[PDB]
């Protein structure tokens, strides 16, 4: 009579590497790196703002190709496609842009209002500012959240608005500078020759000059526009005094930022699905310590790694022997 | 195999064997059959349980952007960012790497090692009571009911 | 007779982690991870420059309330506490600071020296520059390591002085550019509408224009004041030349930077002990490789962890039976 | 558990042994008594404080102030910032949790070891002259006085 | 010395066994000599070979600039970078020190290992036929020529 | 008659470290870090410009004295040495220069070609512009690719150069701007008073006005000199308009950047020998993890780490005991 010891065999064909052995069958075992995605963008609780057709810029500045977005409640990050070039339309610098776009990635509250009403607020002056470049339907127009101020027949007298913040968010507000090509255009444009533009409030002073120069056309202009911006703290007050040149604000925005996020790049279809960790071509759904899905991520997120195998045994060698 | 027993000295394993990792066999005049040890199955899974929560699990996770954008005029301070990114990249693919390596070696040693100690359980008990015949078994010198062969595997035995 | 092997229990309550069990009872073992910290802010070696009531903004230029402080010789980490608000007294921006304060954080020698003396270097021109946002006892004063010049009746004349380097260390120089509200009160201050600041030397060369511009009131003044350095070489010569709005430097500073630091901000006491790691609560007596005490550090420091027990067994199982 | 011996077929520590790690009990008719063997003990001493002194001070360590500063325009340079501090948070925290708890297994199991090699260098000498009882000791078949117990501590037994 | 062979029960080891790993002696009316034992000095070879080759290229290496210039109002950037260089300079020098001390401690102790293994698979064969003499050595019982120590290499002894 | 079971020993001194035991002697190891290199600067493939006497700088702009250099095909990396000052003669501030240093520091297409020919480009203004500052062969000269334009006899004319790519590469394009150090000089250079330096093309619109400031000598130059550049697309087109001060493009360059890469400073010898890594002292035979050569290096490297010693184990522990 004989009893023996030994131990369990399956038909598991899990193949696991050792340090000393490589390709080894065991009977038990659990995969330690995330290898797929979900083919979708997703929420992080909240949902991301798509742009689309558009960019953070055009978005911003009120391309009149972004008319059918507005979309803004409050979001979890920003999503661009390879689609997303309609922004500035006039040629130009947008200054500290992707400045900005970080920190605009993620924001929790966030609400259009009219800073300065087209109507009541520059008598004076003009209100024909549009152009070839920013077309809507094939007429010439111009961004929805800017004003283009010009002379009131043969002149621009020197103008002042205020604005005080009482929305009890942080008020962000664009304008713009405009450069003409020519020191003529300088003056059928604004009339006087030596102008300037300036903007001041508790931690914001600056003056700007028109750069008169030659250039080639962009989008069919030799004239620039520089588009700046600022972030307007509760209580205070911006100051805009100019005699040419300023491309006004119309539309400022008022905000709660949240922490900082990202902007992704990408073509994949935006579901209802939620995920704690977000790449370009999908969600991981991952609580898994390691990933080779993709370097670049929004949220909590395995390491990325650059393996493509990490099988960790749990059960024994697998030694059938029959 | 750096304790000689698994896929050593007991050349193979029981597919026979379905309810747990390790056990006995045993042969009587009752018949035969398989048995899973339950102390040491028990054991090593919660061991084993414990190892894969421990990998898993003792990986702290800070909520990240990651990408960042920088324009033509950035492009020292955009190599930083890639320099950052991969250097982590090198760190995290490495260690990894070696650590499935390392605690692979370890798992297989910590099965060998609980079938060995198994055997020598067995041993000890036996005595002189039964022959090692190799392969992992023991011949009773005397005869050994089903009772009795419960006893070995309790670990109840009891005689000389 | 007989001889048994066996080994060593104890009364050690001592509890480790291990990869298969947790909460492992052993007879002997050492703690990895420093949890606890001194509760006071220590020196390097050398001590640290303490700004109290003032920062580094209001010490540099002399604001009005940090004449009780002046105590610097050599330092090796700057300390600012949570009452450290007298800086820039009359409003504006300080161009580079967090540079600068990055700079200044560890000094090896460090001595004030008049640099254009109040008295002589000023002919053809004023010294009645005070305001009631730079005020002391409540009369109203200025910096007092700045010179506010301004015109002697109705004529302020192109100034021009110059400074060569022959303290045989690095020479700090501060200086402001006044930007007044109005057109008008350019005028009443420096006469010339058409004004500039140039300072120039072997490696600064920069020109100021007053940025005159409607804004609102900080500290009761709608004017502005631009604060500016730079690191005079030994040997080289700063130039300053004015026709308004130059708040010229009274006082500079000769210095020896050593390495780089830090500023820590902090309401611990500060005490003689010394220390080759400081946090912002306290220093760390550190010799273990881990701490969880602050991520934020000064000096030769164990690795922040987010652990909460990293102990070591040394000893065996502890297994007494009773 | 490794080596079986620690917590296994001896099956708990002796409180009475105070001079050292591993050891011996032995009894006479000149009486009884613990006493730790010097030479294993010593070398596990100094083993385990190679060990500690390799985990404590390989340690290399730089003078780094960490803290930034960034104006409320540096707003990326200052989470390229924060994701290089937090990257080395996740790298350190992970590699010394697990550390800990892999030297710490692998420091037990040192110790196991030691017990096992200790009992087999006295199976070895005394071979058939004493009956292994179980739990670690020996039944002299002679009679062994205090000098004979002190050869096999020493490793000296001299005897078929 | 994990597995107490090497520098342990078997107290030395042999210049004269130039062939291999691990191995045998033996002596005969017929003469003496050495000879390695191939099967697991060819594992052991091939093992350690795996475990060198792991950790030479498990490493993987990205193409990399590593030095910035920055000017000198940029010094808070410039010590960003350092902070960055520093931190993977402690990260590497740490996990590569401490990487080295414990493979070498388990490569010494899978020789050791492989030893104790090697000689209980030769005591397993021999049983009773023979007695174990200490420090690796076994005496026959019955005369052992060239063809029978021939069979005990190769694992085929048979003989109760 | 006897079978003994035994191991391996041989007259091996190779000495491991283990985390019970220091020094222990083993039969066989090999070693992991490398601690050697090669005394020589080498390829990557490619071979690396070498700037000699001279910096970046005056390589771009041609000061005199790096006549003698001009090798520029392709390179993997920038070398300078100790010996490299000659780059900016002309006192002055070469703007974002680090910035164009890392971006040109593997450049794999690099051809210098004439793109405003100093004879028939400038009708109307001079061709005596040299100075002592950049002399050579004892002689006044300047720049090689920069054209000093001055006032053809008592008039600056407004001059207006326009240039369009079509290299079908990148075009790097250097100018400079001339800062005189007084309002006469300005006078006696370009006439124009109130002058101005205007650049532009599709993504470059600036301004520039003479900061006319009294300064210390620099090389015996009161004046300064700032440079700039840009990288024009492919098809896009820059455009000079000035009225004095202008230091306008003689030669400009048209590249094709390949992935960036750094630059090494080394006085070691240049060869032929190749590379996958390059450190300033030497390149390292590098297939080993970690290296303690330099921290600094370009390619593909060892990690850089703080040992003296990784030797591993890879035979038993040696006892010889004959
Ligand atoms: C006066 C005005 O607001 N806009 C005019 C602009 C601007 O003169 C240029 O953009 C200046 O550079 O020019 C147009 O040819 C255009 O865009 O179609 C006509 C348009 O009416
Ligand atoms: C002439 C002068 O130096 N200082 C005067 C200032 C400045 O006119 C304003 O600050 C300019 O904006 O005004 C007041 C004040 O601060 O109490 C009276 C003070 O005498
Ligand atoms: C007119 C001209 O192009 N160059 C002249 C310069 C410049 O006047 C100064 O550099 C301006 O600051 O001066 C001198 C020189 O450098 O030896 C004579 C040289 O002829």
């Given at each position: 009579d004989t009893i023996c010891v030994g131990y369990h065999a399956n038909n598991s064909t899990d193949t696991v590497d050792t340090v000393l052995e490589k390709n080894v069958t065991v009977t038990h075992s659990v995969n330690?790196?995330?290898?797929?995605?979900?083919?979708k963008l997703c929420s992080l609780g909240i949902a991301p703002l798509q742009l689309g057709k558009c960019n953070v810029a055009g978005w911003l500045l009120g391309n009149p190709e972004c008319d059918l977005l507005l979309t803004a409640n409050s979001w979890s990050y920003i999503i661009e496609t390879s689609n997303s070039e309609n922004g500035t339309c006039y040629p130009g610098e947008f200054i500290d842009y992707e400045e900005l776009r970080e920190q605009l990635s993620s924001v929790s509250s966030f609400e259009k209002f009219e800073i300065f009403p087209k109507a009541s607020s520059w008598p004076n002056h003009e209100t024909k500012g549009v152009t070839a470049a920013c077309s809507y339907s094939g007429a010439s127009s111009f961004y929805r959240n800017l004003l283009w101020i010009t002379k009131k027949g043969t002149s621009y007298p020197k103008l002042s608005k205020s604005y005080t913040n009482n929305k009890g968010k942080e008020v962000l507000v664009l304008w713009g500078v405009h450069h003409p090509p020519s020191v003529s255009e300088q003056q059928s444009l604004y009339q006087n020759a030596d102008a300037y533009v300036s903007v001041g409030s508790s931690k914001y002073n600056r003056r700007f000059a028109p750069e008169i120069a030659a250039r080639p056309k962009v989008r069919g202009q030799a004239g620039r526009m520089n588009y700046y911006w600022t972030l307007l703290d509760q209580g205070d007050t911006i100051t805009f005094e100019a005699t040419g040149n300023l491309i006004a604000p119309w539309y400022a925005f008022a905000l709660n930022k949240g922490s900082d996020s990202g902007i992704i790049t990408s073509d994949a279809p935006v579901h209802n699905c939620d995920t704690r960790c977000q790449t370009p071509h999908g969600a991981l759904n991952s609580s898994?310590?390691?990933?080779?899905?993709?370097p670049i991520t929004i949220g909590e997120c395995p390491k990325y790694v650059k393996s493509t195998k990490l099988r960790m045994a749990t059960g024994l060698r697998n030694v059938p022997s029959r | 195999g750096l304790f000689g027993?698994?896929?050593?000295?007991?050349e193979g394993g029981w597919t026979g064997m379905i309810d747990g990792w390790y056990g006995y066999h045993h042969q009587n005049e009752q018949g035969s059959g398989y048995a899973a040890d339950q102390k040491s199955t028990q054991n090593a899974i919660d061991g084993i349980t414990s190892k894969v929560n421990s990998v898993i699990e003792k990986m702290n996770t800070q909520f990240t952007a990651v990408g960042k954008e920088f324009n033509n005029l950035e492009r020292r301070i955009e190599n930083l960012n890639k320099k950052v990114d991969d250097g982590f990249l090198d760190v995290w693919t490495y260690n990894a790497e070696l650590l499935v390596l390392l605690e692979n070696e370890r798992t297989l040693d910590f099965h060998d090692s609980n079938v060995r100690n198994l055997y020598e359980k067995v041993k000890s008990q036996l005595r002189n009571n039964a022959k090692e015949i190799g392969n992992g078994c023991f011949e009773f010198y005397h005869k050994c009911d089903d009772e009795c062969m419960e006893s070995v595997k309790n670990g109840t035995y009891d005689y000389p």
């Amino acid at each position: 009579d004989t009893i023996c010891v030994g131990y369990h065999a399956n038909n598991s064909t899990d193949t696991v590497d050792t340090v000393l052995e490589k390709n080894v069958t065991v009977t038990h075992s659990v995969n330690l790196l995330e290898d797929s995605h979900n083919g979708k963008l997703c929420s992080l609780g909240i949902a991301p703002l798509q742009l689309g057709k558009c960019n953070v810029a055009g978005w911003l500045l009120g391309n009149p190709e972004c008319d059918l977005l507005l979309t803004a409640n409050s979001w979890s990050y920003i999503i661009e496609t390879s689609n997303s070039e309609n922004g500035t339309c006039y040629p130009g610098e947008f200054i500290d842009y992707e400045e900005l776009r970080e920190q605009l990635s993620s924001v929790s509250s966030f609400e259009k209002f009219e800073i300065f009403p087209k109507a009541s607020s520059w008598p004076n002056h003009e209100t024909k500012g549009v152009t070839a470049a920013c077309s809507y339907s094939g007429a010439s127009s111009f961004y929805r959240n800017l004003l283009w101020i010009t002379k009131k027949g043969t002149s621009y007298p020197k103008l002042s608005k205020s604005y005080t913040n009482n929305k009890g968010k942080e008020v962000l507000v664009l304008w713009g500078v405009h450069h003409p090509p020519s020191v003529s255009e300088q003056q059928s444009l604004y009339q006087n020759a030596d102008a300037y533009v300036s903007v001041g409030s508790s931690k914001y002073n600056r003056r700007f000059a028109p750069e008169i120069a030659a250039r080639p056309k962009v989008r069919g202009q030799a004239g620039r526009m520089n588009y700046y911006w600022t972030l307007l703290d509760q209580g205070d007050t911006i100051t805009f005094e100019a005699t040419g040149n300023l491309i006004a604000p119309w539309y400022a925005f008022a905000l709660n930022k949240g922490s900082d996020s990202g902007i992704i790049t990408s073509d994949a279809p935006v579901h209802n699905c939620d995920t704690r960790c977000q790449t370009p071509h999908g969600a991981l759904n991952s609580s898994l310590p390691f990933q080779n899905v993709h370097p670049i991520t929004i949220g909590e997120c395995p390491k990325y790694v650059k393996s493509t195998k990490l099988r960790m045994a749990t059960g024994l060698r697998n030694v059938p022997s029959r | 195999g750096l304790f000689g027993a698994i896929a050593g000295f007991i050349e193979g394993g029981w597919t026979g064997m379905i309810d747990g990792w390790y056990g006995y066999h045993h042969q009587n005049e009752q018949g035969s059959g398989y048995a899973a040890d339950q102390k040491s199955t028990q054991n090593a899974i919660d061991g084993i349980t414990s190892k894969v929560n421990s990998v898993i699990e003792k990986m702290n996770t800070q909520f990240t952007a990651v990408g960042k954008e920088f324009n033509n005029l950035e492009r020292r301070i955009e190599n930083l960012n890639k320099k950052v990114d991969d250097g982590f990249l090198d760190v995290w693919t490495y260690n990894a790497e070696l650590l499935v390596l390392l605690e692979n070696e370890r798992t297989l040693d910590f099965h060998d090692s609980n079938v060995r100690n198994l055997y020598e359980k067995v041993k000890s008990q036996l005595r002189n009571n039964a022959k090692e015949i190799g392969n992992g078994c023991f011949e009773f010198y005397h005869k050994c009911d089903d009772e009795c062969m419960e006893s070995v595997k309790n670990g109840t035995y009891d005689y000389p």
